[PDB]
Short mmCIF file of N, CA and C in Angstrom, two decimals:
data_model
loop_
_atom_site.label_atom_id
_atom_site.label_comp_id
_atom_site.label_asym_id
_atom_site.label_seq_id
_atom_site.Cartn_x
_atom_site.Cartn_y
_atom_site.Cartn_z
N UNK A 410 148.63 73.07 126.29
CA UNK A 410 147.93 73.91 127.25
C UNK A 410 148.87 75.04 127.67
N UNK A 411 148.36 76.29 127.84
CA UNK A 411 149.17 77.66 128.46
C UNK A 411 148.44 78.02 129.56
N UNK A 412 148.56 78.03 130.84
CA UNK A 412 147.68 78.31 131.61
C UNK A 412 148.48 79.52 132.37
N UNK A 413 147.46 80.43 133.06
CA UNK A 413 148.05 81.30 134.09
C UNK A 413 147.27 81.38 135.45
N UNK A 414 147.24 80.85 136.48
CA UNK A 414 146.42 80.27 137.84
C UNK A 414 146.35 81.84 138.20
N UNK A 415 145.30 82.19 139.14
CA UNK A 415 145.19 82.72 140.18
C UNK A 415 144.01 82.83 141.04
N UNK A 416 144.43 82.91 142.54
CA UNK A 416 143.74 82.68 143.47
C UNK A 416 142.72 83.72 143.86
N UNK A 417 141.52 83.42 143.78
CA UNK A 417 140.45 85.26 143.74
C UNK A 417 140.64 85.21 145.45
N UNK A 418 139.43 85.84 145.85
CA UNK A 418 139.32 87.10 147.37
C UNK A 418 138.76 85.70 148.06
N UNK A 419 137.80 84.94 147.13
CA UNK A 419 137.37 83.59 147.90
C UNK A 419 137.65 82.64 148.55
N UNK A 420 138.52 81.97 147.03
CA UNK A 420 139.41 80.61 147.77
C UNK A 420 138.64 80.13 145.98
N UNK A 421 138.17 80.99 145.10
CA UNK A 421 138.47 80.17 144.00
C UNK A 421 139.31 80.50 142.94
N UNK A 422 139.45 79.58 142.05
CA UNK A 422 140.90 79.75 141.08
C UNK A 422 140.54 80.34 139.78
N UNK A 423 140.56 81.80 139.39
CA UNK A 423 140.44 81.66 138.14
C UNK A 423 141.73 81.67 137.12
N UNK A 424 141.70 81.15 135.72
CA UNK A 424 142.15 80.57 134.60
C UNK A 424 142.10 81.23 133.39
N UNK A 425 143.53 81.70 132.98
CA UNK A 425 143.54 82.20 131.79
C UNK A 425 143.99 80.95 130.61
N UNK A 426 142.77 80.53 129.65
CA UNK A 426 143.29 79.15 129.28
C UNK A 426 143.86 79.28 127.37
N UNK A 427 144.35 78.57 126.66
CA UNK A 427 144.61 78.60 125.66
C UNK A 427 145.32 77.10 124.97
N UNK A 428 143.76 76.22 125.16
CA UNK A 428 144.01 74.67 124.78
C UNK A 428 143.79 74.72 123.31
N UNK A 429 144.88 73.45 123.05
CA UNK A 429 144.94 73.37 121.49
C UNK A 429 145.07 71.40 121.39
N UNK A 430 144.13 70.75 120.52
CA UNK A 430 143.99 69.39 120.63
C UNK A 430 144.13 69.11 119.06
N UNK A 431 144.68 68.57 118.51
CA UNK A 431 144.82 68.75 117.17
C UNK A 431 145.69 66.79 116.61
N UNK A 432 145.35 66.17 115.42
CA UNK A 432 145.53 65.07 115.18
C UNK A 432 146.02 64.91 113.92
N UNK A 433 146.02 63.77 113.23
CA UNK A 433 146.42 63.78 111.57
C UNK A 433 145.02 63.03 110.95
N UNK A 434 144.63 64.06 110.18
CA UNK A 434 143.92 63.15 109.44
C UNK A 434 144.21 61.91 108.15
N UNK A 435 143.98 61.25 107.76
CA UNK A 435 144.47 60.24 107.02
C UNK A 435 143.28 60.09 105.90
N UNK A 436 144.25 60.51 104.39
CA UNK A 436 142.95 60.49 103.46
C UNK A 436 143.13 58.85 102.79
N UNK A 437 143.10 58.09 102.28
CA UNK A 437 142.67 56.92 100.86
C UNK A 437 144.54 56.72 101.26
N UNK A 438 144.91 55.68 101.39
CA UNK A 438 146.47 55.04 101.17
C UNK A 438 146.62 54.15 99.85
N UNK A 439 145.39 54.24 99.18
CA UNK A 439 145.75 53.64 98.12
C UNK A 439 146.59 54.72 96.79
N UNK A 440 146.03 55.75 97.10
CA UNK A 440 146.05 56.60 95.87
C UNK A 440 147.46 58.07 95.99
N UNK A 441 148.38 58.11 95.32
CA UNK A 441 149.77 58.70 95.12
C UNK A 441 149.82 59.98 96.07
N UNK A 442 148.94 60.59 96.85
CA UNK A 442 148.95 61.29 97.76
C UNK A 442 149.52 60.37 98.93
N UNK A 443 149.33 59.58 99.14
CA UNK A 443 149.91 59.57 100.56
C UNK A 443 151.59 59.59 100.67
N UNK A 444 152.38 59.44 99.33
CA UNK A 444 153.71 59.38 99.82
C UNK A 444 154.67 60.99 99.58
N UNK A 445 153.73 61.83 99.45
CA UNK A 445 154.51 63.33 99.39
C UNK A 445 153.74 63.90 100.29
N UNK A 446 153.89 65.38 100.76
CA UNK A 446 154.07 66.36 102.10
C UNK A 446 152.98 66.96 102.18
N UNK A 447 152.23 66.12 101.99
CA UNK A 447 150.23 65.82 102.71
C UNK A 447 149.77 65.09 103.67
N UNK A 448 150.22 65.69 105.10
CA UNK A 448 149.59 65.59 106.42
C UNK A 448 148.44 66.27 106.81
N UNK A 449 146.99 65.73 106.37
CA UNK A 449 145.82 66.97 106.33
C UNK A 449 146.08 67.03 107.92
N UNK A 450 145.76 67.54 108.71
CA UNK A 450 145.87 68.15 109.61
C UNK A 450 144.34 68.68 110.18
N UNK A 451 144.15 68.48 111.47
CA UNK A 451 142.99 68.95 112.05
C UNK A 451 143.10 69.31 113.51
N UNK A 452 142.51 70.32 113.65
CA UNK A 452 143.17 71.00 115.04
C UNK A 452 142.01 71.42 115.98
N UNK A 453 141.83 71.46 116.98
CA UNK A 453 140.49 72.22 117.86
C UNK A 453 141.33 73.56 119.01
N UNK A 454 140.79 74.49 118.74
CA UNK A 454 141.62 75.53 119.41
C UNK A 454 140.21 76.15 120.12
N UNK A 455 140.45 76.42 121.56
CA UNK A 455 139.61 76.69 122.45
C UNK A 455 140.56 78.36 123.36
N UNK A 456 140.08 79.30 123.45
CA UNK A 456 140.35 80.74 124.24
C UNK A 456 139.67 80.87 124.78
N UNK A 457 139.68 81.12 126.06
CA UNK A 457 138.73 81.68 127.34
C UNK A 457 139.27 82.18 128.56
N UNK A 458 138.56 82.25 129.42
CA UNK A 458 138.26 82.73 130.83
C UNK A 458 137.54 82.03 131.77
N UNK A 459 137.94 81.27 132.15
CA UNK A 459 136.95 80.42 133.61
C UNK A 459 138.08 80.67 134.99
N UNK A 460 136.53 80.70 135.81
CA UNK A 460 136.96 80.58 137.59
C UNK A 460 135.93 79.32 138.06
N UNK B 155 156.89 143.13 176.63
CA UNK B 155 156.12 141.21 176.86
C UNK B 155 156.01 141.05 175.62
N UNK B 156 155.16 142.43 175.57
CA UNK B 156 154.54 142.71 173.22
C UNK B 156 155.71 141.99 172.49
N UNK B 157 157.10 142.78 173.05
CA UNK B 157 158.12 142.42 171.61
C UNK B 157 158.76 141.58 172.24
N UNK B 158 158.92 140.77 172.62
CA UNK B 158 158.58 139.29 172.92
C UNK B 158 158.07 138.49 172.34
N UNK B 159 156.79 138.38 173.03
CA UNK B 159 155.80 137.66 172.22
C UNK B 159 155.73 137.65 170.52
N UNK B 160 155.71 138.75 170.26
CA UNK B 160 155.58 138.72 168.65
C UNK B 160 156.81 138.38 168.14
N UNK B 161 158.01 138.62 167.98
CA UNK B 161 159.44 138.20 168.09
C UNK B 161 159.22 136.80 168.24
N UNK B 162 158.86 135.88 169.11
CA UNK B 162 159.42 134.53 169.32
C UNK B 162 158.03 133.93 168.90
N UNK B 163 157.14 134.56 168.85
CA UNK B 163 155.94 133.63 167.32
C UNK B 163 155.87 133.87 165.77
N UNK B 164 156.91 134.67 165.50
CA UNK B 164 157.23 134.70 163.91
C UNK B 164 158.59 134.44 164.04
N UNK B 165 159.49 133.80 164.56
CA UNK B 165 160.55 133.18 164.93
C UNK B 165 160.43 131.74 164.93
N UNK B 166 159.45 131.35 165.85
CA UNK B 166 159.36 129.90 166.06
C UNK B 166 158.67 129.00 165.07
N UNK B 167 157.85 129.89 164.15
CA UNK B 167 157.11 128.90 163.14
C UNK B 167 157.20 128.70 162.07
N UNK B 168 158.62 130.03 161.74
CA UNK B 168 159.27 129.82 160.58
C UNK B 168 160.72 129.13 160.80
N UNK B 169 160.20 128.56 161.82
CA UNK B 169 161.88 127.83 161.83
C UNK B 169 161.14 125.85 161.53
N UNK B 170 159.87 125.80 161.23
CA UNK B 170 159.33 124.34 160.83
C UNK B 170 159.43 124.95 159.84
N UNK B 175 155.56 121.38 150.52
CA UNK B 175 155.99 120.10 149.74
C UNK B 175 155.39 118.84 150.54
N UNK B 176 155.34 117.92 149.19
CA UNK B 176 155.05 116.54 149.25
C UNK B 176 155.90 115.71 149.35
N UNK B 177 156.27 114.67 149.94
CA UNK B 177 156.71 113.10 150.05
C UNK B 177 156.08 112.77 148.94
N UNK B 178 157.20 111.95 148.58
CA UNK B 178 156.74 110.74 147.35
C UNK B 178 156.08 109.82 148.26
N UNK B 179 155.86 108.50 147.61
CA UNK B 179 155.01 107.56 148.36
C UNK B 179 154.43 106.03 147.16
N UNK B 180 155.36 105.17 147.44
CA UNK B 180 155.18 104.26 147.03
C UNK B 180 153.58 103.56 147.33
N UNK B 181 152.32 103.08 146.22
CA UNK B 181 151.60 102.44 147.59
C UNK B 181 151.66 101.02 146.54
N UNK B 182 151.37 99.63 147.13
CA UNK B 182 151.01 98.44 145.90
C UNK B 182 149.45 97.77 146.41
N UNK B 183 148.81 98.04 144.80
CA UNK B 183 147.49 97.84 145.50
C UNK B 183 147.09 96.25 144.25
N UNK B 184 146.84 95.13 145.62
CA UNK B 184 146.75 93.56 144.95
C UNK B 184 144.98 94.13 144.55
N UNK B 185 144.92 93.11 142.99
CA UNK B 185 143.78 93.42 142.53
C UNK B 185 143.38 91.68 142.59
N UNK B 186 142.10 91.55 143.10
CA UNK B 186 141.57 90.19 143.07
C UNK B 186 140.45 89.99 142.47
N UNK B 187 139.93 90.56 141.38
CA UNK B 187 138.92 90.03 140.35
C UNK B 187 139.11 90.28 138.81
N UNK B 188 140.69 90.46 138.39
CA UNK B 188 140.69 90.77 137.35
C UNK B 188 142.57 90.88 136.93
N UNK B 189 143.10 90.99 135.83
CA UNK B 189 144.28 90.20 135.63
C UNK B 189 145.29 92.06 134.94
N UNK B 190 145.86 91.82 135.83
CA UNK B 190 146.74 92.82 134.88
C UNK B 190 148.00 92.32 133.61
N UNK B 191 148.34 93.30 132.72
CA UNK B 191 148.63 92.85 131.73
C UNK B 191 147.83 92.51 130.06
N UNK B 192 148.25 92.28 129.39
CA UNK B 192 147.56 91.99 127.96
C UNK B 192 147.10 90.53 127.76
N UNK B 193 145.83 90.48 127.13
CA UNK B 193 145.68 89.17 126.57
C UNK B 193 145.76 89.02 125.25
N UNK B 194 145.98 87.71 124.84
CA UNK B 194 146.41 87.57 123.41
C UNK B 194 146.24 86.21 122.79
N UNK B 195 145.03 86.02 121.89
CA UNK B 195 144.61 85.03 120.70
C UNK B 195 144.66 85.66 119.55
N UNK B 196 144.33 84.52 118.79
CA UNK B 196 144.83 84.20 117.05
C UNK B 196 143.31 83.81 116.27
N UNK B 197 143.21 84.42 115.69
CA UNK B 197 142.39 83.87 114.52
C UNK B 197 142.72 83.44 113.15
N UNK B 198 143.64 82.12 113.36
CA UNK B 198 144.18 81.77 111.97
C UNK B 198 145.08 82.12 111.44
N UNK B 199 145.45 83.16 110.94
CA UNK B 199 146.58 84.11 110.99
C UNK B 199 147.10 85.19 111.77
N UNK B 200 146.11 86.00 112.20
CA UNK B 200 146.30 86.98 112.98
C UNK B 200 146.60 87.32 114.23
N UNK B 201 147.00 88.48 114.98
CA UNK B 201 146.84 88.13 116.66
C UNK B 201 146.51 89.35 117.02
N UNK B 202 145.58 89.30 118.20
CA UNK B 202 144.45 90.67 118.05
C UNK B 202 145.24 90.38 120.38
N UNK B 203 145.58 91.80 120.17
CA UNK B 203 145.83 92.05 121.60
C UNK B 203 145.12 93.16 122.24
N UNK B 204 144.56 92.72 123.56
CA UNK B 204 143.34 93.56 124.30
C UNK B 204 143.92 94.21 125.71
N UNK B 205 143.87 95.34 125.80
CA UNK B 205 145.34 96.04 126.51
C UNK B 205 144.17 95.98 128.13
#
């Protein structure tokens, strides 16, 4: 998460956001891919603006 | 009285440009500075 807070004229908060959620995917362990430099990889990347 | 008078009112008012002037004005609905995301490779900045 990168966040940058600030407080508006109200009393509410708006948010400059830049979330990133990301895991390993895992293909077949039976078969000669899994022991060389194949980490498939999967990522969710979210940019916005909320108050 | 005349040279007098006229004497000590083109005397007196030539004896009295801009000032700089700092002002800071807080902005509360909107962010100063650049924003900046990626599309995969790239990075696209919005001034």
């Amino acid at each position: 998460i990168r966040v940058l807070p600030r407080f508006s004229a109200d009393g509410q908060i708006e948010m400059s956001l830049d979330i990133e959620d990301g895991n390993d995917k895992t293909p077949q362990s039976d078969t000669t891919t899994s022991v060389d430099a194949l980490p498939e990889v999967g990522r969710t990347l979210i940019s916005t603006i909320a108050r | 009285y005349v040279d007098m008078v006229v004497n000590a009112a083109t005397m007196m008012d030539k004896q009295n440009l801009g000032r700089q002037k700092i002002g800071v004005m807080r902005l509360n609905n909107t962010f100063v500075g650049d924003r900046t995301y990626n599309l995969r490779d790239q990075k696209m900045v919005i001034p």
